[PDB]
């Protein structure tokens, strides 16, 4: 039973600029569809197959597309495409400016995360730990990286990231890899997660490394029950923490901030050595990954609240109910704006009052 909400002295108040419903949001997915921004537009998909492009400051709908099929991985955007994956293993590319379908490629396995693109190749990470590179123009397969090698009881829900000429991925098997984005050949591989054993051969578990790319640092914080940061160019371990682990991580003010779904949020130093503060009060509230919005750390919970915590102290300074079906997706902060995507599909844009 989630911990009851606690009283606090309100110091930070959100101003709701616009809200738009996109389909059924996450529907019955166990994984998450994440909206993404490119320039002045925010793009969002829903489990029912509805995809939208919205002017991110006004809320004006630029285009909608009803794909009429089970979208399970999404939004990828860039270089003129919006990209989603389906539970049937389809990767569908839509024109970023009009929403017109450009192509569809049926891939080997379910796609449970947003494809990435550099405008030449679309990189798709599958439930069964393959990275597939597709031609951005046609969808035709360019390369495949399959060290998978199993396993039927894990689902990888990590999204691939393009750094330079590298595609990075945290695989369900617990290994982070960097491959050549043009050829699909490995550049480095680094085991971060604790090795699997058996005795979870009778259960299906979803695995995500919780990747966050910031410059030369790739944070990998969501493998149980460890957390690490890697050099993006070599895979070298910069630091690690045992006895974790975290729903996700965010940077701000020279520190990092983590949440643990089970209901703590914590600030740590740059190198995750020492703890700056810890707020336990959201005990069983099933937190999203954290975002830093101005001087606040923010997390969504199962009841649909976003909580704002002081970056200095961890104390509650703000709270806003967004979508009562819950907020599981990391709030998306772009400068002075924050976009929260509720489980029922409410996409809401906030600024901090009086701005």
What would the keywords be for this entry?
4-stranded antiparallel beta sheet, monomer, palmitate, 355 residues, Methylamine Dehydrogenase, Chain H, mainly beta, globular, cell outer membrane, 0% helix
Secondary structure blueprint with pairings:
Blueprint: E1 14-21, E2 36-38, E3 41-45, E4 50-55, E5 61-66, E6 71-78, E7 81-86, E8 90-95, E9 101-106, E10 116-117, E11 121-125, E12 130-135, E13 141-146, E14 154-156, E15 161-162, E16 166-170, E17 175-180, E18 186-191, E19 205-207, E20 211-214, E21 217-220, E22 226-231, E23 237-242, E24 248-252, E25 255-260, E26 264-269, E27 275-279, E28 291-293, E29 296-300, E30 305-310, E31 316-321, E32 332-334, E33 337-341, E34 346-352
Parallel strand pairs: 14-19
Antiparallel strand pairs: 1-34, 2-3, 3-4, 4-5, 6-7, 7-8, 8-9, 10-11, 11-12, 12-13, 15-16, 16-17, 17-18, 20-21, 21-22, 22-23, 24-25, 25-26, 26-27, 28-29, 29-30, 30-31, 32-33, 33-34
